[PDB]
């Protein structure tokens, strides 16, 4: 009884670890993407106004 | 209102010219570029009418206060006093939301002038009243 | 007889850094030198290059009178990397990095 009172908890902190370094891992490369997209800069957009 | 001969050059092609020095910056070296070849092709490298217009838009600045962008540029009695061509590229950097950006523009645009007649310029700033023998020395 | 040479003015300041806008298209400034910001008639501002831009813009990092740095000051650049004074003569001593003494109570390197 005691042993799977352990496991629960350790299955339970794996998967919330597991859960949270994909997480982690996504906003890492959103991150990233983002900044380029401040990297990169705007074009000029040259129309007739009148 | 604007004429055709501007629209072309507009609609059209011009960074890619060739001219006398290669311009760093953003968009603003397309707005100090633009006058360039109004000023060189249609006015026959009459320079100096729209460095005056800048000059002109100073004293216009201050008298129609910091909002001068809502305004369009064409229909105005106090713009009446400037040139098409000035208007025309104000009303693009109007579209294009760039209008506090005008001083990068000038800053380049005498750039463009200064090499072409090749006329480096000098500032100096002597005193609250020039002094001759300092003048004469400096 | 020594007139110190600038590059631009002071664009954006955020924080400890800032963005440099250069006055000339034809200057051009090397990397990782040292730049000076006129914070005022007085005091200058030391200052690094950690980016240099296709807009010609200056990422740079700001080391001393951070304070003082506003939009449009004037900007001067030494030509030459960050240097500190070095010599059996700073034994015994507390040293910001930038070689200035921290009071208590010829070479470069």
Redesign the interface.
Known sequence: GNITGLMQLADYTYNKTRKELITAELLEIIGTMTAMHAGKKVGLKKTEFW | ??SPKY?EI??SDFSRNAYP???????HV?FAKLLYSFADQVENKKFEVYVEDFKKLDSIIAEKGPFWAEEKI?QSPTFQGLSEGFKFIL??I???GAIDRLE?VR??YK?LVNEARKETTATVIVAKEPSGNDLAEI | LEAKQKIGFVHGIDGTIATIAPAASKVTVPYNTVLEIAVSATNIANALVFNLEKDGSIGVILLDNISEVRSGQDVYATGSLLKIPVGFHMLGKIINPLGKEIPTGTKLG
Do not use: R, T
Not at chain 2, 21 to 27: A, F, I, K, R, Y
């Open positions: 209102v604007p629209i507009y609609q020095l290669e311009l760093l910056g953003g968009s397309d064409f009303g693009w109007q579209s294009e990068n800053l380049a750039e």
